[PDB]
Design a protein around this ligand. Structure first.
Ligand SMILES: CCCCCCCCCCCCCCCCCC(=O)OC[C@H](CO)OC(=O)CCCCCCCCCCCCCCCCC
Ligand SMILES: CN1C[C@H](C(=O)N[C@]2(C)O[C@@]3(O)[C@@H]4CCCN4C(=O)[C@H](Cc4ccccc4)N3C2=O)C=C2c3cccc4[nH]cc(c34)C[C@H]21
Ligand SMILES: CC(C)CCC[C@@H](C)[C@H]1CC[C@H]2[C@@H]3CC=C4C[C@@H](O)CC[C@]4(C)[C@H]3CC[C@]12C
Ligand SMILES: CCCCCCCC/C=C\CCCCCCCC(=O)OC[C@H](O)CO
Ligand SMILES: CCCCCCCC/C=C\CCCCCCCC(=O)OC[C@H](O)CO
Ligand SMILES: CCCCCCCC/C=C\CCCCCCCC(=O)OC[C@H](O)CO
Ligand SMILES: CCCCCCCC/C=C\CCCCCCCC(=O)OC[C@H](O)CO
Ligand SMILES: CCCCCCCC/C=C\CCCCCCCC(=O)O
Ligand SMILES: CCCCCCCC/C=C\CCCCCCCC(=O)O
Ligand SMILES: CCCCCCCC/C=C\CCCCCCCC(=O)O
Length: 370
């Protein structure tokens, strides 16, 4: 009885994990770098996430792949062991916290439509990116500092974190790298649902007010009613609609003061084609916001879902004393790769819902770059 040979698994992983990861993230980086249209603040998150996922595919996965074909033994120099473990925890944690930063960033966009200057957005973006990387470095730093337990005649050292030396880090590190942002994203999810629901209402409320007052105006016999039902209505591109409407209200009110109801009611008629222009525009944005938020929700949920097996089994392998550790480890060795896949192809799947990105990709796969 023997372990056997796992060459076919290695081949499989090279085919359906590493290549997808590298190719996908490369495409995203190329897209953002080449396309002028795509060079705005919020896409710099994506580029930062892409690099993180790209580096996992270049430096982390192939070593993880080596360790699979040479047992617990560590063929590389010992010094590269804590380094590989550092980069692994670093990049993996970064990809998760990146999605949390995007989630919250997108919520604030919906809630606070104003204050969206690109000039500020770029700086603010960079700051956020840097914070995410700082949080990642923070979470990953215990590994190299603690070091690995160290030889007789040869070196029989296995490159792995032990439950005796890193049980806490595994527990609190898991809490820090996965469950915290998960909670944050859940809260953000519900805040976003509430935000949109709230947004939809106020619009219908103002529609109602306008319609009601216009109804009052169009049936008015005297001037007092017209003048009365006009002040109630009086309550860069954003302020333009305000100036226009308020201007028209004042124009009609100026006629109402004159006592020319026939003129005012006619001026009020023009307000219909005016409200229909801004209500139909404002009511259109929330639709896109809703569709977008739904897509991001599903996609991000799938990402989070594919990481559960690892961190849950991780904490269980630490806490559960009665559980069979052999099977738990055997499971972990798979769940690690399921996680690698998750983070590996995430940015691509996400950006594939954008026509610009998607077209760019289509042009890049045929090797045009023009
Ligand atoms: C804070 C900003 C105020 C949001 C608000 O204007 O609130 C408005 C709105 C309530 O009407 O908020 C909501 O809808 C309620 C959202 C809160 C949902 C609670 C999530 C539970 C957290 C689980 C994490 C693990 C513990
Ligand atoms: C994907 N990556 C995997 C990586 C890892 O397990 N690397 C080793 C080398 O591989 C193991 O899984 C092997 C395979 C099967 C048996 N193994 C183990 O038992 C122990 C896990 C363990 C240690 C102590 C106690 C319980 C379990 N392994 C290891 O140390 C650690 C990560 C991590 C740990 C803590 C916080 C984190 N945030 C992000 C991450 C991360 C990224 C995340
Ligand atoms: C695993 C080892 C043996 C080989 C792995 C090589 C990988 C990195 C190769 C295989 C297929 C290659 C991709 C094939 C096609 C494209 C589209 C092109 O417009 C830019 C690069 C890109 C995205 C390549 C990036 C590198 C790539 C993903
Ligand atoms: C084993 C020791 C660990 C390291 C082993 C590495 C093995 C990687 C194998 C193939 C490299 C292929 C290189 C492909 C790099 C693509 C980067 C790319 O071109 O994207 C940059 C961007 O497009 C520009 O703006
Ligand atoms: C900005 C950084 C923010 C939080 C970093 C929190 C770091 C969390 C990592 C702590 C790991 C830990 O304390 O492990 C102790 C050691 O393993 C013996 O128990
Ligand atoms: C599992 C825990 C139970 C409820 C999950 C509720 C769904 C939480 C899925 C989070 C995905 C997310 O990031 O949502 C961002 C939000 O949609 C910004 O647009
Ligand atoms: C080893 C396989 C490497 C395969 C690399 C396939 C993509 C390389 C590529 O298309 O490069 C574009 C060219 O350099 C435009 O100047
Ligand atoms: C994009 C499609 C995703 C590709 C699927 C890749 C998922 C990886 C699956 C399992 C890898 C197994 C590696 C561990 C070796 C032992 C395998 C075993 O005993 O079953
Ligand atoms: C240490 C980590 C290095 C990560 C570099 C950050 C890339 C940001 C992309 C812009
Ligand atoms: C405003 C918020 C300012 C940013 C600071 C937030 C981070 C504060 C503390 C993080 C909690 C981590 C506890 C320290 C762990 C030390 C250790 O054991 O490694």
């Amino acid at each position: 009885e023997e372990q056997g040979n796992k060459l076919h698994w290695a081949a499989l992983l090279i085919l359906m994990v590493i290549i997808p990861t590298i190719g996908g993230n490369t495409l995203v980086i190329l897209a953002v770098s080449l396309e002028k249209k795509l060079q705005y603040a919020t896409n710099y998150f994506l580029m930062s996430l892409a690099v993180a996922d790209l580096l996992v595919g270049l430096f982390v996965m192939p070593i993880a792949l080596l360790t699979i074909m040479f047992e617990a033994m560590w063929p590389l120099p010992l010094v590269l062991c804590p380094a590989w473990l550092f980069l692994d925890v670093l990049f993996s944690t970064a990809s998760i916290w990146h999605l949390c930063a995007i989630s919250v960033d997108r919520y604030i966009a919906i809630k606070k439509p104003i204050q969206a200057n690109q000039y500020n957005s770029r700086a603010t973006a960079f700051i956020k990116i840097t914070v995410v990387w700082l949080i990642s470095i923070g979470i990953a730093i215990p590994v190299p500092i603690k070091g690995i337990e160290t030889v007789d005649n040869p070196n029989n050292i296995t490159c792995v974190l032990t439950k005796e030396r890193f049980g806490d880090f595994m527990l609190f590190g898991s809490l820090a790298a996965f469950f915290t942002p998960l909670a944050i994203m859940i809260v953000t999810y519900f805040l976003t649902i509430h935000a949109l629901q709230k947004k939809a209402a106020d619009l219908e409320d103002n529609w109602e007010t306008l319609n009601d007052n216009l109804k009052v105006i169009e049936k008015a016999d005297n001037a007092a009613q017209v003048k009365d039902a006009l002040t109630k209505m009086r309550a860069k591109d954003f302020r333009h609609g305000f100036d226009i409407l308020v201007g028209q209200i004042d124009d009609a009110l100026k006629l109402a003061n004159e006592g020319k109801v026939k003129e005012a009611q006619a001026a009020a008629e023009q307000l219909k084609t005016t409200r229909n222009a801004y209500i139909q525009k404002y009511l259109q944005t929330i639709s896109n916001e809703q569709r977008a938020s739904k897509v991001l929700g599903i996609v991000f949920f799938l990402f989070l879902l594919m990481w559960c097996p690892f961190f849950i089994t991780n904490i269980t392998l630490v806490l559960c004393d009665s559980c069979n550790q052999t099977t738990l480890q055997m499971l972990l060795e798979i769940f690690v790769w399921i996680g690698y896949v998750s983070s590996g192809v995430n940015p691509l799947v996400y950006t594939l819902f954008n026509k610009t990105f998607r077209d760019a990709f289509g042009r890049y796969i045929t090797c045009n770059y023009r």
